[PDB]
Ligand binder design. Structure first.
Ligand SMILES: CCCC[C@H](NCc1c(COP(=O)(O)O)cnc(C)c1O)C(=O)O
Ligand SMILES: CCCC[C@H](NCc1c(COP(=O)(O)O)cnc(C)c1O)C(=O)O
Lengths: 396, 396
């Protein structure tokens, strides 16, 4: 049965981790995956996370099955993070949330749901976007079409091209939006553009599917949900796949959520039962640990406060790193002007490097970046900044 | 988009948990899901598990991504549990293991793998079997056909009917076998029958897919893998989906594994890369916690020893419970003879009750069993045994 199976090609992002580790050479620098790093080059477990974990160790009485949709308080907390406390979506019971194995798993169950209980056949993903978007959707049978987004020359959001591209999307089609910290460009629509996209969307009959994997990394928790909340004010139906991998440093525990919104409770209940049916044929119920950590930290005044501070420290460190990056590049001798890096949000920056340039950096300097020229700014430290910038300049 | 979505029907097994909890009445007894219970009616976290968890709390330095296939030592330990330490499958590097979100998730990734990189179109599942088997396979596009198994009259393995049913399966078809503790019958093939099934299988060109969710609950760890090991001695290719939910009481942490076996390392490597591609489009990488617990307990002499004893205590308690069950039924006034219950293995017993009988038990006595008449023996305690047996007799 397996004699003819052809070797699958490596993930441009994940296949990078293998090379990096298999690669010897001490000075090797890893700017691939979007994993946070502190000033020392380590990606530690948050203190608030350690505290919640000890709490669980002493207060956990059983490991009994968690229920299809996971932990309730977990679901309640995510909806408030996403829509705000007052929110009518919460008051009218228009939304239902399922705990999932990461944001990747939230996207898959969303795909599985749509492809089986809906008439959707195509999903629109920005160009560029997280490579794995296509794969998740293709696996569910949906077709992936792309819309324009990045103005490479000026390094901005090419809104006209965006509108014009989406003009080809029909009613009943799914359009995927990154809530904030666009991967891999770092450029996001303003609130005006978000409202404009909301207006257009309700007229074209599109189903918005928001991917929120970096809430809190652009401006702040609440501010980062401004786009999403603008859509939710006008849409009767929307799906949101969110993650707690970055803002909670819970990468390997697979904590995410798929939030379903319908016109009213009765409908969302019906729609949700089918979603739970999609989870049951996939993994049964979700992993409790990482989610129990999130719910306990969020349900507790002191723990949440500590967490919120750790989060703003991560955001601020990245912000210092990109500024230092731009300056050291100039200081080091780079001809091109990289000031636009300072304008991007999140952990990355679209360096604007060519494929051969990223190939030489790795091969010749042990510096690891994604082929698209995406570099993880949160992986830059005051100590690796210099050899990194020298590598880059000698490749420009 | 969601206005026409029809409400999905409840899982015969999982939908039971809802009813049970939504049902008031103190004396209500739950014999539904296959979750272990101790003499007090609680399903506690194992001591060995608590010890490994404390170890992690103090020794864990990061929550950084785990890699597509999960923890290596985890994979190494499961292969030894499944095939034995000496095993040539291990020595020849013929097997590869991926850590997954439970045994359910191992079945799905197996399905996703086969349906996309193989020419399989149909999977054979015993009648009866775990209801969710059909759903997982149907979700991947494969077709589910059934083979005979249980001789309801004599309460035995109808091997002739089994052979005769499978005679309709073509070469290149997948046949699913329960490694031990057949769900829901509790009847398993002898080693002779296992070898016979192995012989037949290699001649008909079937791809064996073993579902191991109860290793250690029939006779013992090693003995329970006798069937599987007989197949592995003769087959060049096989897939095994195993779980650590019951034998480790890690239900809600989703710990399982999908083991791929091919003729040689080069082939399995090629086949495995595609499997990893199937995991990437589903959930990325697996949840670390429950798996780190399993690897730490298994890699440690003292912890493993404690775990092995906790496991044999669970097995033995169940064995005392079914014996008490049969006796109290006779003592209480049941006309029928239920001695065959004593012959079954695992947590359950196919009571042989009718749908209307299980309906009346619940509705009238608050006793919860699966419609098929499957009752969780590991949920019976010396204290609930009497009202339970009285409920049953007044329904016969
Ligand atoms: C999972 C490995 C990729 C990490 C990272 N992208 C992770 C990621 C996800 C989902 O990740 P989690 O499942 O871990 O929640 C969703 N959406 C975006 C836009 C992401 O960048 C990157 O390299 O950009
Ligand atoms: C998951 C809820 C069902 C529990 C139980 N069947 C669980 C179960 C599984 C997979 O379960 P995990 O994913 O939790 O590893 C695989 N195979 C069998 C034969 C099972 O009975 C039952 O009610 O029989």
């Amino acid at each position: 049965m397996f004699e003819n199976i052809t070797a699958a090609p490596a993930d441009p992002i994940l296949g990078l981790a293998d090379l990096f580790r298999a690669d010897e050479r001490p000075g090797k620098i890893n700017l691939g995956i979007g994993v946070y790093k502190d000033e020392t080059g380590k990606t530690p477990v948050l203190t608030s996370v350690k505290k919640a974990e000890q709490y669980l160790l002493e207060n956990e009485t059983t490991k009994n099955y968690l229920g299809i949709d996971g932990i309730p308080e977990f679901g309640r907390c995510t909806q408030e993070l996403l829509f705000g406390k007052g929110s009518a979506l919460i008051n009218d019971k228009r939304a239902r949330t399922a705990q999932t194995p990461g944001g990747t798993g939230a996207l898959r169950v969303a795909a599985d749901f749509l492809a089986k209980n809906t008439s959707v056949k195509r999903v629109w993903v920005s160009n560029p976007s997280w490579p794995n978007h296509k794969s998740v959707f293709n696996s569910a049978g949906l077709e992936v079409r792309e819309y324009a987004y990045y103005d490479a020359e000026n390094h901005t959001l090419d809104f006209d091209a965006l509108i014009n591209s989406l003009n080809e999307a029909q009613a009943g089609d799914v359009v995927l939006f990154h809530g904030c910290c666009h991967n891999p460009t770092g450029i996001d629509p303003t609130l005006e553009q978000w409202q404009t996209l909301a207006q257009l969307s309700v007229e074209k009959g599109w189903l918005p599917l928001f991917d929120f994997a970096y809430q809190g990394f652009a401006r702040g928790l609440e501010e980062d949900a401004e786009g999403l909340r603008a859509f939710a004010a006008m849409h009767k139906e929307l799906i949101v796949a969110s993650s707690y991998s970055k803002n909670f440093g819970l990468y390997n525990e697979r904590v995410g959520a798929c939030t379903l919104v319908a016109a009213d409770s009765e409908t969302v209940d019906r729609a949700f039962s089918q979603m739970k049916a999609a989870i049951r044929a996939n993994y049964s119920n979700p992993p409790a640990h990482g989610a129990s950590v999130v719910a306990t930290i969020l349900s507790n005044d002191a723990l949440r406060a500590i967490w919120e501070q750790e989060l703003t420290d991560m955001r601020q460190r990245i912000q210092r790193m990109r500024q230092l990056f731009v300056n050291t590049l100039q200081e080091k001798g780079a001809n091109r002007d990289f000031s636009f890096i300072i304008k991007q949000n999140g952990m990355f920056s679209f360096s604007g490097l060519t494929k051969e340039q990223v190939l030489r950096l790795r091969e010749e300097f042990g510096v690891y970046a994604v082929a698209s020229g995406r570099v993880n700014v949160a992986g830059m430290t005051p100590d690796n900044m210099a050899p990194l910038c020298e590598a880059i300049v000698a490749v420009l």
